[PDB]
Structure 1
Amino acid sequence: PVTLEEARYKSFSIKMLKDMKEGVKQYGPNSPYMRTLLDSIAHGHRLIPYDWEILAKSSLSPSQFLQFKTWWIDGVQEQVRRNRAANPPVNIDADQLLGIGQNWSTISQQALMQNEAIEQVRAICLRAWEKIQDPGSACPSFNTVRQGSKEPYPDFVARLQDVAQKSIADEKARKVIVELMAYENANPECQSAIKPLKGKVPAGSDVISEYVKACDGIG
């Protein structure tokens, strides 16, 4: 990170990388413990585009690093598209968010980065990180995920919320699809207990909270 006294760079401690690689190998890079460690490290310091590549190469398996770099590129493409239609078009070009080129390829140039580019790249890398699968499987579709019988109900909502966290871009459009896909793919006998479905939902109480409160008895 940097420290601004003006603006010198020091590398990571070794102890942070050690338990970072420990946690990534043990729990998988989307279990929420690592997810809340990562933004804690991100907000507790002041990161640069050179540092994220160091941490990602040091932590993930070699197969996953290409996926992380791919969704980094796909994020910065949409970011540099949306950053030109503003008023004024704010001067943050593409290459400064990747740390390459004739002016941002090394450390001593990148230590002078202003706050707005940091606030870009933090959100872009954090959006990027959760598009990384467990190293055995590929992300399926909503038509495939459907709970059977003899199985507890909230595990189904957990799996469906994980898939909808992966494959949906906007968080409001994420928030809409989940509860109706949870209703539409449940068990038969549980679904009857949810048959009110509307008008038992006042404004303010979160709707996905009430559904499990219906189906807690069936085990």
Structure 2
Amino acid sequence: EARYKSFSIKMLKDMKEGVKQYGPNSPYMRTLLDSIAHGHRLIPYDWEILAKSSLSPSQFLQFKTWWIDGVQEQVRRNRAANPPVNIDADQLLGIGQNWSTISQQALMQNEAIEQVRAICLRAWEKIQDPGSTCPSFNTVRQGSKEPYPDFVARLQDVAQKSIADEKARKVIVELMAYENANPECQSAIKPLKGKVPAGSDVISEYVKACDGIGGAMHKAMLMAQAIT
């Protein structure tokens, strides 16, 4: 991450972190990809950088391998077109005498550009999901002094950003809302957990139950418990 300054830093910094804490195929990352891909039209060079600067080394290597395969697919299609489309593998990858540096890739037509975009995004989706890298839905833990309402919001935020199906997302938040809570709050949730009535939102009850923990009142109570 050196070289003084590139034509764009923030977005690349953000995505790099995003991938590390949410995963290459996460809703969060997929959203940014969608955003940036449809907006800042990219050339094969750009994609080379965008992935290189945001995916972990091994993840990049899978991306690029898949990329190449995707290109090959489209080249078959382009030769099979009637009329044929004059776009070779070299143009789609940004590899060769005619499509090397930015100056040549800058002259790509929208047909080629689009086709590259499609390919890459497919390739991206083909990146193997991390089963171990900061699966943030279970790394977020309540800090010793953090208000439960902040915790939960944080948790949910992460869940929105990592878990794709809302149904599952909901379950996970509920489970983690208990499991990763600090002792101070688990003791409030434990007698509630599993007894929450239908209709009422679970994490909603959980906030209520913990309402007050961390304040003066709570401390006083615990001081009573220390003496008694």
Whether the TM-score (by the shorter chain) exceeds 0.5 is: yes
3-state secondary structure, aligned to 1:196:
coil
Aligned to 2:219: none
| Structure 2 Cα separation of the partners of residues 129 and 35 of structure 1 | 9
Relative to the length of structure 1, the TM-score reads 0.57
User: Contact between 1:24 and 1:59, CA under 8 Å: does it hold in 2?
Assistant: yes
Q: Report deviation, 1:135.
A: 3.7
Alpha-carbon spacing, 1:16–1:110, altered in 2? closer, same or farther (3 Å): same
Aligned residues: 213
Secondary structure of the corresponding residue to residue 142 of structure 1? helix
Partner of 1:3 in structure 2? Answer: none
Q: 1:80 to 1:166 in 2, by over 3 A?
A: farther
Question: Which structure is richer in relative contact order (CA contacts within 8 A, separation 6 or more)?
Answer: 2
Shift of 1:134: 3.0
Structure 1 counterpart of 2:76: 81
In 2 relative to 1, CA 38–216 (structure 1 residues): closer, same or farther, beyond 3 Å?
Answer: farther
SS across alignment from 2:53: helix
* 8 Å CA contact retained: 2:19, 2:29: yes
Range with bigger deviation, 102-111 or 162-171: 162-171
Q: Flag structure 2 segments of 5+ consecutive residues without an equivalent.
A: 214-228
Distance 1:105-1:163 versus aligned 2 partners, 3 A rule? farther
Task: Pick the structure with greater CA Rg.
Answer: 2
**Higher normalized helix content (fraction of residues):** 2
> What is the deviation of 1:17?
1.1
Alpha-carbon shift at residue 154 of structure 1 (Å): 26
Contact in 2 for aligned 1:64/1:135 (Cα 8 Å): no
* Shift in alpha-carbon separation, 1:13–1:179, aligned structure 2, 3 A: closer
Kept after mapping to 2: 8 A contact 1:139/1:163: no
- The match for 2:16 among 13, 21, 24 is 21
**Aligned residues: CA RMSD:** 9.3
Instruction: Give 3-state SS (helix, strand or coil) of 1:105's partner.
Output: coil
TM-aligned CA deviation for residue 12 of structure 1? 4.0
User: Structure 2: how far apart are the matches of 1:57 and 1:217?
Assistant: 47
- Where do 4+ consecutive residues of structure 1 move more than 2 Å? 6-12, 134-218
